[PDB]
Amino acid sequence: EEEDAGLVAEAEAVAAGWMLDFLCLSLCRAFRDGRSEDFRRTRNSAEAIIHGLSSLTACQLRTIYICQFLTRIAAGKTLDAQFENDERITPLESALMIWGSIEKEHDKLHEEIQNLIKIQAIAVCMENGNFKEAEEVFERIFGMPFKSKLLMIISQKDTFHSFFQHFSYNHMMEKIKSYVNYVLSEKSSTFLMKAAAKVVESKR
Amino acid sequence: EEEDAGLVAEAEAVAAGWMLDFLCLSLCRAFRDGRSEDFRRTRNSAEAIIHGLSSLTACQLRTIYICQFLTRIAAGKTLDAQFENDERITPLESALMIWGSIEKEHDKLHEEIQNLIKIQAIAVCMENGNFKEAEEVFERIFGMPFKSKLLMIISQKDTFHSFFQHFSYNHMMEKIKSYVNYVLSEKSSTFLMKAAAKVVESKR
Numbered sequence A, B: 001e002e003e004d005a006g007l008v009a010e011a012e013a014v015a016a017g018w019m020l021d022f023l024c025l026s027l028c029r030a031f032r033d034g035r036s037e038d039f040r041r042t043r044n045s046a047e048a049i050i051h052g053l054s055s056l057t058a059c060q061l062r063t064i065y066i067c068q069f070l071t072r073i074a075a076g077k078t079l080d081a082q083f084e085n086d087e088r089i090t091p092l093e094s095a096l097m098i099w100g101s102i103e104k105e106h107d108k109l110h111e112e113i114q115n116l117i118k119i120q121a122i123a124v125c126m127e128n129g130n131f132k133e134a135e136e137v138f139e140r141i142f143g144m145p146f147k148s149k150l151l152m153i154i155s156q157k158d159t160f161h162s163f164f165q166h167f168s169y170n171h172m173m174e175k176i177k178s179y180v181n182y183v184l185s186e187k188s189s190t191f192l193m194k195a196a197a198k199v200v201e202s203k204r
């Protein structure tokens, strides 16, 4: 029966939406906690569920973008990882593209995270001795004072410059964890986590 | 806080249990319907969720066994697929091992499915011209009248024997779909599908 098959596919789409929100919340918490292996396994589950979803609401696209952004940040030092069809794009460059695409308020924290990802996208290339790649990442990102300081550091091959210690990788991760905390607060009330929490609490 | 972290991990285990039952029901329905691509994508989601689950109840192990059994049956003609650490084990042999391990009633249908998988495990080797592999699968499976008919067909290299048309691959799939229908009936009332169905119905 067409009608029965249709009702079941509609229910599978509702359940997939619920699973996506739950996995995003689980992924945010593993990122905030630094649970590296749980983040890897959760990322695998979220990716698979996303492939079983076709039509997306604006809320679901934002949820997917957040999962993809955290995945790229977690792989920010893995210059061998190719997240885009254009193989030249580094993981932090991919994270920056998603950050600029999310339907979200452009507050002070948004811009601080944005600039820290720009500095570290160059820094990670320098730390690996990839000086020509650093200058190419520089050209793609900036395509005045902040910009000229970076170009001077690149041309001098000053990998461990003191500038990269004031706007360090750890500083970028901490600012991102601050944003993650707000997403965790926002998604802690979604259906599947709320129902699971009520079951656990009922057994206490 | 230890207590907070613990409560969250307990809720993640509850939600993963709910997702496992839902994905098993979705996988059974794709198998019954012959929706090949939906089965592949659902299998990917179920596998990922299973890796995020540690402790399993007897009910959860049975659910996982059913997913694995259907995956092996769907790949029954893919002799290049290695489902076990011992690389000699074919997909239908792997399906037979799981079938004999599930905590389930050994009714007439159970034995009919069992014998049809045994015949087809040999038949699929013969159809690919792998006559020596067919005799090795025969030795592992039977390790009297049914047994002697099979050995004669193998030694004669009678790939398209009429015996394999009375106990055909399609006959095995139809008997398995009959069992799948009972699993679909049994899992249609699980939490996540029930909740998603109620939402869809509320919008009608």
Ligand SMILES: O=C(NC1CC1)c1cnn2cccnc12
Residues within 6 Å of the ligand: A043, A044, A046, A047, A050, A064, A067, A068, A071, A083
């Ligand atoms: O963006 C990714 N994942 C986000 C949606 C959860 C993603 C990119 N590569 N990859 C490989 C395995 C698993 N997930 C990934």
Ligand SMILES: O=C(NC1CC1)c1cnn2cccnc12
Residues within 6 Å of the ligand: B043, B044, B046, B047, B050, B064, B067, B068, B071, B083
């Ligand atoms: O047994 C398997 N899946 C069942 C649990 C759902 C299984 C075996 N290989 N494989 C590859 C990709 C995805 N799932 C698989």
